[PDB]
Write a protein that binds this DNA or RNA. Structure first.
Ligand SMILES: Nc1ccn([C@H]2C[C@H](O)[C@@H](COP(=O)(O)OP(=O)(O)OP(=O)(O)O)O2)c(=O)n1
Ligand SMILES: [Ca+2]
Ligand SMILES: [Ca+2]
Length: 322
DNA sequence: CCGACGCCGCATCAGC
DNA sequence: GCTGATGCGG
DNA sequence: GTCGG
């Protein structure tokens, strides 16, 4: 939080470019600026000092200059004043509603939560779930709760089949005190890059998590990715825990280290590493690291090996929260 | 100046 | 039905 | 919006 106001300002410009303008690359630009400024270990004294970092260029320089002078950003004060921009922005905070649906909705008269509550009629299933739990999903999850959740997921996965390994990734594996949601990497002997020895491997686990009422809703569900809704059980008389987003990814077992690297993130860490891969002549996805169009996967025994390939020192999870 | 901006699963759509 | 594009979120 | 070449 040394430059919290600067990174906040850049975050919300990024939000605006993603949601309103539908300018995915200006969203990445702004969020890369924000990232590199968030780990800079001095209080930024000027836009000139700021432009010295990679990803801060001329235009963000001038806006950093404006913001320290005055403590605000005209471009943003007027983006907050526009009734249409501020409502499309709000709609995208509903899970399942993005920049396209958000804009379409306001074009139909729909711009408040109340309008959504009246017109669940007009929402696909995901967006209905996103609405249903809109306030819960706005909440963060304390690491203590994450721990209870992980003890449930892992104990229930062991009951299905003992050869399953479940790993919780995301911000939790990076050691954050609070997570936005839960992310579970699953492996099983029967599923490698080479064959799929059994069906329903993901199904069986979700099924069991539904049986004991841990999983409450399904946003989407395929062979290898599950995105749904879970909730901790609560004791007699107590208020109910908030419902929480959960993602399970079944990754072939010999590609664990590429899966856990992907899934540990952060998003911006993933993007910078894969874009640095591209400069060393590689491409990393969540299954393989292949040389460069892609050739054959190179052998991977550990997360560090992926780092060793693109000529990076190893970075423990805790240090990947960019 | 200018390409090129990380990589992908699932849902949905239009075209067939 | 598929295939590819598009949307969305990981 | 930024940047390397
Ligand atoms: N655009 C994205 C989004 C996510 N991920 C990867 C890295 C993330 O860490 C992981 C999980 O997505 P999350 O949104 O849950 O990211 P976090 O766990 O880091 O943040 P939060 O504490 O909000 O849950 O998937 C990615 O590679 N690219
Ligand atoms: Ca998460
Ligand atoms: Ca997640």
């Amino acid at each position: 939080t040394l430059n919290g106001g600067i990174t906040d300002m850049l975050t919300e410009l990024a939000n605006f470019e993603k949601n309103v303008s539908q300018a995915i690359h200006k969203y990445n630009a702004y969020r890369k600026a924000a990232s590199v400024i968030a780990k800079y270990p001095h209080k930024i004294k000027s836009g000139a000092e700021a432009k010295k970092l990679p990803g801060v260029g001329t235009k963000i320089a001038e806006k950093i200059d404006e913001f320290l002078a005055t403590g605000k950003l005209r471009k943003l004060e007027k983006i907050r004043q526009d009734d249409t921009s501020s409502s499309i922005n709000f709609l995208t905070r509903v899970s399942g509603i993005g920049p396209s649906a958000a804009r379409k909705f306001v074009d139909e008269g729909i711009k408040t939560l109340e309008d959504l509550r009246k017109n669940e009629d007009k929402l696909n299933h995901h967006q209905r779930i996103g609405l249903k739990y809109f306030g819960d999903f706005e909440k963060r999850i304390p690491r203590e709760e994450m721990l209870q959740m992980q003890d449930i997921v892992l104990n229930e996965v062991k009951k299905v089949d003992s050869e399953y390994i479940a790993t919780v990734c995301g911000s939790f594996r990076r050691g954050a005190e609070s997570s936005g949601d839960m992310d579970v990497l699953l492996t099983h002997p029967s599923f490698t890059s080479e064959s799929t020895k059994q069906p329903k491997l993901l199904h069986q686990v979700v099924e069991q998590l539904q049986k004991v009422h841990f999983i409450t809703d399904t946003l989407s569900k395929g062979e290898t990715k599950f995105m749904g809704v879970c909730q901790l059980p609560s004791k007699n008389d107590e208020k109910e825990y908030p419902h929480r987003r959960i993602d399970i990814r079944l990754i072939p077992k010999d590609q664990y280290y590429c899966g856990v690297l992907y899934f540990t993130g952060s998003d911006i860490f993933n993007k910078n590493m894969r874009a640095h891969a591209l400069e060393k002549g590689f491409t990393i996805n969540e299954y393989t690291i292949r040389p460069l169009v892609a050739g054959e996967p190179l052998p991977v025994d550990s997360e560090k090996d992926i780092f060793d390939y693109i000529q990076w020192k190893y970075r423990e999870p805790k240090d990947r929260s960019e």
